[PDB]
């Protein structure tokens, strides 16, 4: 069993600090 | 209905970050239902619906939402937004098994990131793209090796970039997946080197899951390196963390792996001990698959030392399953 690292996703927000 | 939309989306964002995507989704879907005249807000909403459903393992819906986001990002001429949606669509397509299109999309994320001189985005795109090529070679022969080698090059490129960026967690991700790609290609020494780096970084972050993974992966490589005692020792470590993490499924997994290793080391007493522990954990989890393989494993070990009847007991036991 190969243990993989997870994907990344790009995130957006409705607010920008 | 723009403020109400803004407000509803805020709840969804909070809940998804809160770790519960189910409720957040409903609040995002509510926000959509209310609507807004601001297309960049809708975009953000679509994007988050897509990530939540992706993490909720509904890939069909993740695909639709990211696709809407991508289209809207172009409509409004938001380049960073287009790159992001494109990467998200890419990753989703990979899970669904359209590799050709996943490549195109992740490449888009990469190409736009470069135009924007966005180094963080660029590196992330390289990793996602590496993942696609890796999955492509794994799912399947010259094309197979070619895809796996493409993944290696892409991980190497990511690592180079995230080293400059000082991003340790990105290094951790790329090292692990690089290691597993070397493993598939049959370069075991190189796999070991990569997973060793993955382990250092997991220990650095205090991440026990990642640490367990590295140990497992190292154990596997040493099996094919023909060094059995060393593999058993890394499995010993995974057993500890599995108990530590309170993960029984993994604990059982550790036991099984140790069982087979001691079988290769030709010590069948320890083999039986761990196969017994696997058998126990398997039933506990109501795993019929492992149960039979455990019965089979035990039958062999007892046969190895010529234990007679007890071998036959697990034989029948396995026969039933
Ligand atoms: Cl497309």
Which residues lie below 8 Å from residue B197, measured CB to CB, with a gap of 6+?
B171, B175
CATH number belonging to domain B1-321: 1.25.40.10
B253 interaction partners in chain A (CB closer than 8 Å): 1
Coil, strand or helix at B193: helix
- The angstrom resolution of this structure is 2.4
- Residue B191: name the closest of B167, B168, B222 by CA: B222
- Residue B311: name the closest of B278, B259, B268 by CA: B268
In angstroms, the separation between the Cα of residue A16 and the nearest Cα of chain B is 11
CA distance B130 to B321: 40
- Residue B96: name the closest of B62, B134, B133, B129 by CA: B62
User: Experimentally, how was this structure solved?
Assistant: X-ray
Whether B45 and A14 have beta carbons less than 8 Å apart is answered as yes
Helix axes B21-34, B2-17, angle to 10 degrees: 170
CA distance B125 to B61: 22
Ligand 1: centre distance to CA B85 (Å): 10
Query: Which tokens in the block code for residue B312?
Result: 């036959």
A15 interaction partners in chain B (CB closer than 8 Å): 10
Which residues lie below 8 Å from residue B45, measured CB to CB, with a gap of 6+?
A14, B5, B9, B12, B28, B31, B32
**All structural domains of chain B with their residue ranges:** 1-321
Tell me how far CA of residue B16 lies from CA of A16, B12, B19, B25, B44, in angstroms. 17, 6, 5, 8, 14
Ligand 1: centre distance to CA B42 (Å): 19
Within 10 angstroms of residue B108's Cβ, the number of other Cβ atoms is 19
């Amino acid at each position: 069993v190969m243990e993989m690292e997870p994907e990344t996703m790009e995130t957006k927000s409705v607010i920008d600090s | 209905g723009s403020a109400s939309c803004l407000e509803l989306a805020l709840e969804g964002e909070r809940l998804c970050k809160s770790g519960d995507c189910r409720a957040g989704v409903s609040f995002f879907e509510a926000a959509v239902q209310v609507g807004t005249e601001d297309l960049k807000t809708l975009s953000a909403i679509y994007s988050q619906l897509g990530n939540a459903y992706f993490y909720l393992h509904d890939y069909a819906k993740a695909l639709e939402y990211h696709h809407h986001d991508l289209t809207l990002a172009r409509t409004i001429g938001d380049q960073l937004g287009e790159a992001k949606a494109s990467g998200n669509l890419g990753n989703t397509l990979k899970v669904l098994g359209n590799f050709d299109e996943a490549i195109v999309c992740c490449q888009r994320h990469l190409d736009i990131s470069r135009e924007l001189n966005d180094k963080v985005g660029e590196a992330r795109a390289l990793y996602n793209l590496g993942n696609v090529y890796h999955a492509k070679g794994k799912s399947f022969p010259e094309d197979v090796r070619n895809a796996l080698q493409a993944a290696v090059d892409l991980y190497e490129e990511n690592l180079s970039l995230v080293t400059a960026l000082g991003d340790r967690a990105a290094q951790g991700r790329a090292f692990g997946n690089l290691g597993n790609t070397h493993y598939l290609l049959g370069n075991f020494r190189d796999a070991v080197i990569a997973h060793e780096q993955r382990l250092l970084i997991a220990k650095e972050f205090g991440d026990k899951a990642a640490e367990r993974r590295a140990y497992s992966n190292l154990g596997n490589a040493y099996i094919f390196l023909g060094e059995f005692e060393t593999a058993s020792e890394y499995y010993k470590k995974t057993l500890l963390l599995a108990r530590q993490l309170k993960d029984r499924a993994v604990e059982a997994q550790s036991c099984y792996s140790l069982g087979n290793t001691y079988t290769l080391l030709q010590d069948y007493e320890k083999a039986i001990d761990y196969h017994l522990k696997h058998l126990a954990i398997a039933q506990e989890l109501k795993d019929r698959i492992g149960e039979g393989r455990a019965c089979w494993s035990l039958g062999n070990a007892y046969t190895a030392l010529g234990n007679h009847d007890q071998a036959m007991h697990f034989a029948e036991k396995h026969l039933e399953i």
